Amino acid sequence: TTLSDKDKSTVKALWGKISKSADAIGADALGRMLAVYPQTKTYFSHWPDMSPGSGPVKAHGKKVMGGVALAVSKIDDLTTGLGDLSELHAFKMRVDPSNFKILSHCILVVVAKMFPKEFTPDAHVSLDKFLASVALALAERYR
Amino acid sequence: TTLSDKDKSTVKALWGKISKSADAIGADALGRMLAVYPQTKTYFSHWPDMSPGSGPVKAHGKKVMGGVALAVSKIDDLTTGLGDLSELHAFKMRVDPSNFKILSHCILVVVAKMFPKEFTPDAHVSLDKFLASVALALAERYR
Amino acid sequence: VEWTQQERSIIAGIFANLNYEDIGPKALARCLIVYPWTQRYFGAYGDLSTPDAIKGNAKIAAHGVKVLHGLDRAVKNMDNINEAYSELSVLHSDKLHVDPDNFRILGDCLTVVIAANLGDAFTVETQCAFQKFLAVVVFALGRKYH
Amino acid sequence: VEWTQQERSIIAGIFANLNYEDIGPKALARCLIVYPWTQRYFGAYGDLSTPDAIKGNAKIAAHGVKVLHGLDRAVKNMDNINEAYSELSVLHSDKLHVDPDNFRILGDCLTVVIAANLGDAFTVETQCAFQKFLAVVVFALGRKYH
Numbered sequence: 001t002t003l004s005d006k007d008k009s010t011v012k013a014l015w016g017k018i019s020k021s022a023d024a025i026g027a028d029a030l031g032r033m034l035a036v037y038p039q040t041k042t043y044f045s046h047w048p049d050m051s052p053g054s055g056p057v058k059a060h061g062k063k064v065m066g067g068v069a070l071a072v073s074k075i076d077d078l079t080t081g082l083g084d085l086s087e088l089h090a091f092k093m094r095v096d097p098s099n100f101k102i103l104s105h106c107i108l109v110v111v112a113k114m115f116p117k118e119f120t121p122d123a124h125v126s127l128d129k130f131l132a133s134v135a136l137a138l139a140e141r142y143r
Numbered sequence: 144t145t146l147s148d149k150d151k152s153t154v155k156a157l158w159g160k161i162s163k164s165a166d167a168i169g170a171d172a173l174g175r176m177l178a179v180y181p182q183t184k185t186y187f188s189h190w191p192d193m194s195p196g197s198g199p200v201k202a203h204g205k206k207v208m209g210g211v212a213l214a215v216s217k218i219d220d221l222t223t224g225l226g227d228l229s230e231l232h233a234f235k236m237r238v239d240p241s242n243f244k245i246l247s248h249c250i251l252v253v254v255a256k257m258f259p260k261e262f263t264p265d266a267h268v269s270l271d272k273f274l275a276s277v278a279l280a281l282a283e284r285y286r
Numbered sequence: 287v288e289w290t291q292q293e294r295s296i297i298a299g300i301f302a303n304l305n306y307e308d309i310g311p312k313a314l315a316r317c318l319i320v321y322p323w324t325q326r327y328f329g330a331y332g333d334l335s336t337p338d339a340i341k342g343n344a345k346i347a348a349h350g351v352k353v354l355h356g357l358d359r360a361v362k363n364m365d366n367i368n369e370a371y372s373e374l375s376v377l378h379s380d381k382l383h384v385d386p387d388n389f390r391i392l393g394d395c396l397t398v399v400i401a402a403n404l405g406d407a408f409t410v411e412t413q414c415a416f417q418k419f420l421a422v423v424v425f426a427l428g429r430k431y432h
Numbered sequence: 433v434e435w436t437q438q439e440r441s442i443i444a445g446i447f448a449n450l451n452y453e454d455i456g457p458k459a460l461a462r463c464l465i466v467y468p469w470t471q472r473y474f475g476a477y478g479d480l481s482t483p484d485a486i487k488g489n490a491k492i493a494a495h496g497v498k499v500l501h502g503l504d505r506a507v508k509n510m511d512n513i514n515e516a517y518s519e520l521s522v523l524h525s526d527k528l529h530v531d532p533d534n535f536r537i538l539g540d541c542l543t544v545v546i547a548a549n550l551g552d553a554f555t556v557e558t559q560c561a562f563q564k565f566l567a568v569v570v571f572a573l574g575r576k577y578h
């Protein structure tokens with residue numbers, strides 16, 4: 001649903017605090033997505049080792065979080081901003097959009113683990129809404 | 144996700160063939176929702192007869208397809224068009240948005256049952272999108 | 287799950303004279319069209335570029351029949367569906383890499399197809415029993431993903 | 433489900449060590465803030481008008497404690513969760529009319545609260561087991577909705 005001005009400044013302020021750890025958030029969130037929800041492993045079979053902290057997991061966690069960084073910068077217009085990334089998920093990897101929600105949940109869990117003081121319920125509600133907007137923007141080109 | 148011109152003209156076309164039976168679609172799809180997914184009954188405890196075809200199910204089913212009818216008129220901008228109904232769902236009934244997908248699936252099953260030859264895969268994809276857009280519009284005012 | 291006799295009879299009744307060569311292709315084609323990411327797995331199946339091509343694709347049709355016949359073992363073994371699908375779950379996971387969310391989605395397409403086909407015979411209780419059956423089968427098919 | 437000894441030890445370890453008066457309120461308050469529709473059930477609980485009101489609300493807090501203690505029977509007998517939660521499921525369905533989808537989302541908020549609390553001790557395996565446990569409990573709580 002539409003992000004309010006409160007949501008956008010909430011997400012930006014939180015991103016200002018956590019963005020320095022974008023690589024470690026991504027690695028941990030992806031590793032937890034794979035292990036806790038092994039349905040998602042089906043998109044990663046090309047990789048030897050999907051275990052937490054493995055080379056491919058760190059490498060891909062970093063890519064994903066770069067996507068989230070882009071989304072924060074393109075927050076006023078996530079549809080246009082993530083159009084190319086939507087295209088890629090739609091037609092190359094063809095990730096069932098149901099997986100977007102799962103990773104979003106894993107990112108929130110890793111943010112709460114790494115930044116427990118900053119991740120108040122108020123931060124959480126806005127970041128949750130933001131990641132749902134991200135997921136919707138990613139789904140845009142699928143059909 | 145955003146409705147294309149193709150989706151909008153597909154939905155308008157299907158709606159021109161099926162709109163005469165909106166009351167029957169609604170009654171059937173709500174009775175099916177309640178029976179097949181009894182978790183949804185939790186919002187209808189004030190009207191205990193939730194049996195298929197009952198008075199309350201018929202009336203509530205008619206109300207829902209009235210909103211679907213309005214959503215068809217307001218298809219170019221459901222966020223604005225359904226804002227008052229979103230406000231009602233958000234703060235009066237407070238229906239967990241998860242249920243909107245359940246009812247949408249039940250509407251699709253009924254439209255297929257009543258209009259098997261008109262309900263082609265092509266009509267189905269565009270109607271499914273439209274109902275997802277409806278659900279998203281209705282979730283707008285929740286938080 | 288605890289089945290009622292009514293549920294077991296409805297499920298037997300849906301399958302006993304099922305036209306698999308009709309229903310199977312309709313269900314899978316519909317799924318490929320409504321949820322196009324499910325085409326991931328069918329790169330070896332040839333032309334999938336339009337709805338018309340998918341609906342005319344005999345290789346996808348033959349697969350729709352195969353998947354539909356895949357419910358047979360559940361119909362025959364309703365109290366033991368976990369055990370009956372354990373090997374098929376292994377296959378879809380370890381060999382095929384099919385996202386199990388797609389099982390849910392295909393079931394919803396199958397429902398729509400059976401609803402269209404049965405008309406008045408697709409009563410409320412029929413939907414209830416068939417939904418219960420699909421939920422059990424889909425769960426079963428997801429069990430051995432690790 | 434099929435538990436491993438490690439899952440048993442972890443689940444038992446989480447609840448053995450837990451400050452219920454802290455985690456209980458935080459999980460329930462977070463759920464009422466992040467998912468405001470879940471507020472519908474608490475019309476007799478006073479001020480829910482801001483995140484601040486909710487986090488400062490003693491009756492909501494007492495309730496969070498009670499819900500969390502409501503996991504105790506499941507931790508104690510992990511093998512009989514369906515049976516154990518029978519009466520609780522009936523209560524939530526017939527008396528309280530709680531949408532069982534809210535159990536899942538409270539489960540997600542609880543996970544966030546525990547992760548924030550345990551930091552590095554919330555290992556990946558800890559999260560695998562906790563989620564598996566919430567999934568079993570959430571299923572059992574939804575079983576008697578009819």
Ligand code: HEM
Nearest residue numbers: 040043044060063064066067068093095099100103104134
């Ligand atoms: C917050 C949601 C997500 C974001 C922001 C995101 C972002 C990205 C980005 C930026 C890339 C690399 C693009 C490039 O190379 O230029 C990527 C690749 C990829 N992503 Fe997504 N992603 C998300 C969710 C998911 C999910 C849920 C899955 C699967 C379960 C997934 C699977 C993949 C795969 C398989 C690749 C290609 C990786 C490779 O093999 O090198 N993504 N993603």
Ligand code: HEM
Nearest residue numbers: 183186187203206207209210211228236238242243246277
């Ligand atoms: C396609 C999605 C839906 C649409 C378009 C829709 C539309 C509507 C409309 C137009 C009304 C009447 C509002 C009025 O009094 O002016 C209504 C009422 C209501 N809806 Fe929704 N609805 C949808 C989904 C749902 C779902 C999934 C549930 C619960 C499972 C639900 C529960 C209710 C309830 C309890 C009422 C009030 C009954 C009454 O006061 O008579 N709705 N809906």
Ligand code: HEM
Nearest residue numbers: 324325327352353355356357374378382384388389392393
């Ligand atoms: C109702 C759910 C499903 C059932 C019961 C089912 C059943 C089956 C069965 C019995 C086979 C052949 C197994 C064998 O060779 O021993 C098969 C193969 C296969 N299925 Fe599934 N299936 C289901 C859903 C899906 C879905 C949703 C997809 C993807 C969209 C899919 C993709 C595949 C693929 C790619 C093969 C392998 C073709 C081959 O190389 O032989 N299936 N399935």
Ligand code: HEM
Nearest residue numbers: 470471473474498499500501502503528530534535538573
């Ligand atoms: C882990 C999931 C949950 C568990 C284990 C749980 C457990 C409990 C327990 C033990 C009780 C007291 C029962 C008794 O006194 O006999 C209770 C009551 C209640 N629960 Fe749940 N609960 C859960 C989730 C929820 C959720 C998500 C909501 C709504 C957001 C909710 C709303 C209520 C309400 C309104 C009461 C009655 C309180 C009153 O009498 O004022 N519960 N629950």
